[PDB]
């Protein structure tokens, strides 16, 4: 990769008029500095390597914070439905484009702390992060039979270790991930009542990628410990297919809705610099 | 010369004498499904000239105070002849579009319309409840819908409207309207052109899709500069939208889906 060199230009006096154009056509006028001013020869050594879509998306973004407790029977297990849409940064970066297709590198950073003073100390905890594909049974208790994980993928993490890492492939049932969906899941048909045929706008599949179930494997210590598993999401092998303007007002929900922050630009006069 | 153009598609002909050069969206002409990309196994119907023809949508009125207009594809052609019948008789459908917007005014008028083609043109709702807009308002037909100058919550809890509230500078989706130019677009500037032509390929994450559930393309027309004329009272000029579907193919023939209305 290399940018084109700036070519040298003398003064022009010609019928060729590159400065005038027509934005009614929808074409951008593809000018260089050689077309409007006198230029010297410059061999250009800058590259656009850091502005590729792979370089744009090769960062890990925090996507969920999953709270879980180790306690005498309050939150002994937690389930989180997998989506990027509840953290704004990776959502905005993905929502530059309409369709995408990437492999995905999950990373789990676990932190834990005591929550009371008197009741002794605790040994090192083991954390299980079970993937529940959509249709596999959700646990009802922390010691349910669902944690036997005969077919579900399951990372066992020991506290104090480096953060656990998982690759998943492109799992989408379509040929690309649809960031935006201008449609419904159901069409209401004539003669159906008002309780039938309704579906959310922009929803598509209501459980698209399943969920992660987090528990502490250990039995309860006499002191309550509270743990937070932070889930870090880094796209790789990224392809993107239809560019969109980025989001200008604060996000409100999974859709494109807005209610607050509708005045994003500040006040500056027309002729002040 | 490039100002004069003729488009002919299945016993419909459009001629124009003040055209800007037409846009093929993303450099891709519409095409049929290749055998390396086909998902359904059944034989598609290809209606050709019975469906691939220009249909004229209902005329909207441009005014000085007006905010802008929007349509959805293929939803705006759901009552247009054999294309609408083939859409409602089949589970899966795919079409590209040629979109022609007509707006003629005199040399003493001024104003400019940006005509934007948006893939997956989602529009924001009217209430604090997320994703709540019903089918009958998100699929309005050929009358389309209008942008609004400001956001307004629906306070009615008993009979909620479940409508869109597309704010014009927010482009109905929370993005800046000046940044809408990365979509395929033309500008009808009344001193130079009176028409805009956008040829749109089928753009989706699937090779074919349920047309009654899902809309591939949206057409948004926003006044970039307002309409003005020297008469002290008022002025109005018509805008006409003429759309031909292109490379139509349909799979999954069954009984007719009659969707719910009002």
């Amino acid at each position, epitope marked *: 990769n290399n940018l084109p060199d700036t070519q040298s230009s003398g003064p022009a006096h010609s019928k060729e008029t590159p400065a005038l154009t027509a934005v009614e056509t929808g074409a951008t006028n593809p000018l260089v500095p050689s077309d409007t001013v006198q230029t010297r020869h410059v061999i250009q050594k800058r590259t656009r390597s850091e502005s590729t879509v792979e370089s744009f998306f090769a960062r890990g973004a925090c*996507v*969920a*914070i*999953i*709270e879980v407790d180790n306690d005498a*029977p*309050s*939150k002994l*297990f*937690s*389930v*989180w*439905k997998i*989506t990027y849409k*509840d*953290t704004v940064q990776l959502r905005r970066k993905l929502e530059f484009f309409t369709y995408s297709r990437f492999d995905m590198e999950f990373t789990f950073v676990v932190t834990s702390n005591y929550t009371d003073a008197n009741n002794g100390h605790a040994l090192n905890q083991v954390y299980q992060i079970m993937y529940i594909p959509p249709g596999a049974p*959700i*646990p*009802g*208790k922390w010691n349910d039979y669902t944690w036997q994980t005969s077919s579900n993928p399951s990372v066992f993490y020991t506290y104090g270790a480096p953060p656990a890492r998982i690759s998943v492939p492109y799992v989408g049932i379509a040929n690309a991930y649809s960031h935006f969906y201008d449609g419904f899941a159901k069409v209401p048909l004539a003669g159906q009542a008002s*309780t039938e045929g*309704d*579906s*959310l706008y922009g929803a598509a599949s*209501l459980n698209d990628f399943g969920s992660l179930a987090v528990r502490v494997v250990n039995d309860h210590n006499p002191t309550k410990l509270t743990s937070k598993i932070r889930v870090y999401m880094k796209p790789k092998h990224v392809r993107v297919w239809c560019p969109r303007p980025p989001r200008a007002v604060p996000y409100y*929900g999974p859709g494109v809705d807005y209610k607050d922050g509708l005045a994003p630009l500040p006040g500056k006069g027309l002729t002040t610099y | 010369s490039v100002r004069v153009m003729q488009l002919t598609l299945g016993n419909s002909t459009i001629t124009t004498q003040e055209a800007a050069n037409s846009v093929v969206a993303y450099g891709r002409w519409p095409e049929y499904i290749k055998d390396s990309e086909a998902n359904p196994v059944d034989q598609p119907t290809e209606p050709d000239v019975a469906a691939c023809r220009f249909y004229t949508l209902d005329t909207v009125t441009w005014r000085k105070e007006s905010r802008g207009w929007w349509w959805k594809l293929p939803d705006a052609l759901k009552d247009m002849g054999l294309f609408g019948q083939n859409m409602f008789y089949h589970y899966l459908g795919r079409a590209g579009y040629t979109v022609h917007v007509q707006c003629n005014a005199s040399k003493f008028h001024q104003g400019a319309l940006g005509v934007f083609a948006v893939p997956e043109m989602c529009l924001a709702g009217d*209430s*604090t*409840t*997320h*994703m*709540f807009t019903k089918y009958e308002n998100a699929n309005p037909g050929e009358k389309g819908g209008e942008f609004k100058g400001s956001f307004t919550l629906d306070t009615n*809890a*008993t009979n909620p409207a479940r409508n869109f509230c597309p704010v014009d500078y927010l482009f109905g989706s929370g993005v800046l309207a000046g940044n809408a130019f990365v979509y395929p677009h033309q500008i009808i500037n009344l001193r130079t052109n009176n028409c805009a032509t956008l040829v749109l390929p089928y753009v989706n994450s699937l090779s074919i899709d349920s047309m009654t559930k899902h809309n591939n393309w949206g057409i948004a027309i926003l006044p970039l500069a307002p309409l003005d004329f020297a008469t002290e009272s008022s002025t109005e000029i018509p805008i006409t939208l003429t759309i031909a579907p292109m490379c139509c193919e349909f799979n999954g023939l069954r009984n007719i889906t009659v969707p719910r209305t009002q």
Partner: antibody
């Protein structure tokens, strides 16, 4: 432990509810208000969150009600700015402390109401 | 809709099994797993009997069970006994962050 303040009657004028709880549940958990007309069923009225000084009102009562907190004595208050004859009801103070397993948004825990107070009847008649 | 719909009264013999339905819409039951059930006797504060879908609090007997079918939910009491006579309330979370109760169901034992 959850305590509810007295029982009341007047027509027209404003009425102030009071609910006092233990310090741990005041520090950690949200307080929900529920009303119930005789034989007519439960109606949600709103939430007050003394852990982060936040409150949410139901849409039927959003112009009328206001919730406040008393951080030095673990007490929350519920004030109805005007009264109507339909407001003749038994009222409940509830603490949300049963956690859902499902993560709310992707950053928070959701709690169901599982500890309920003794309650307060208010009648609105001449 | 606002309030979630419930049947007004359900009757059953001892030892039989009853189902009490709760039909909402796409923004409370059809979107969230935060669907719960309560049991109320005369003069008593309500007691939580099901908190997540299919999940029971400690101390609630195993004859109470529930499930989701999309936009509607149900509570099943199997092998009905005379202490189960009372009023049963559905509960759910709407996506505008308001909470909503059901209309109640007076269950009487024949």
């Amino acid at each position: 432990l959850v305590q509810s303040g007295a029982e009341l009657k007047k027509p027209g004028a404003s009425v102030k509810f009071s609910c006092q709880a233990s310090g741990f549940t005041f520090t950690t958990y949200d307080i929900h208000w529920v009303r119930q007309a005789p034989g007519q069923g439960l109606e949600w009225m709103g939430m007050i969150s003394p852990s982060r000084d936040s409150t949410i009102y139901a849409q039927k009562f959003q112009g009328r009600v206001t919730m406040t907190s008393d951080t030095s004595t673990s007490t929350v208050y519920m004030e109805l700015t005007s009264l109507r004859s339909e407001d003749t009801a038994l009222y409940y103070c509830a603490t949300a402390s049963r956690p859902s397993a499902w993560v709310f948004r992707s950053l928070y825990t959701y709690y169901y109401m599982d500890v309920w107070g003794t309650g307060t009847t208010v009648t609105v008649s001449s | 809709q606002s309030a979630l719909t419930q049947p007004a009264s359900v009757s059953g013999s001892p030892g039989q099994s009853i189902t009490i339905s709760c039909t909402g819409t796409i923004t409370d039951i059809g979107y969230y797993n935060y669907v719960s059930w309560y049991q109320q006797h005369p003069g008593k504060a309500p007691k939580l009997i099901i908190f997540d879908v299919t999940n029971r609090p400690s101390g609630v007997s195993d004859r109470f069970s529930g499930s989701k079918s999309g936009n509607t939910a149900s509570l099943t009491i199997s092998g009905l006994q005379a202490e189960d006579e009372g009023d049963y309330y559905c509960f759910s979370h709407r996506s505008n962050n308001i909470r909503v109760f059901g209309g109640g169901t007076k269950l009487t034992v024949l």
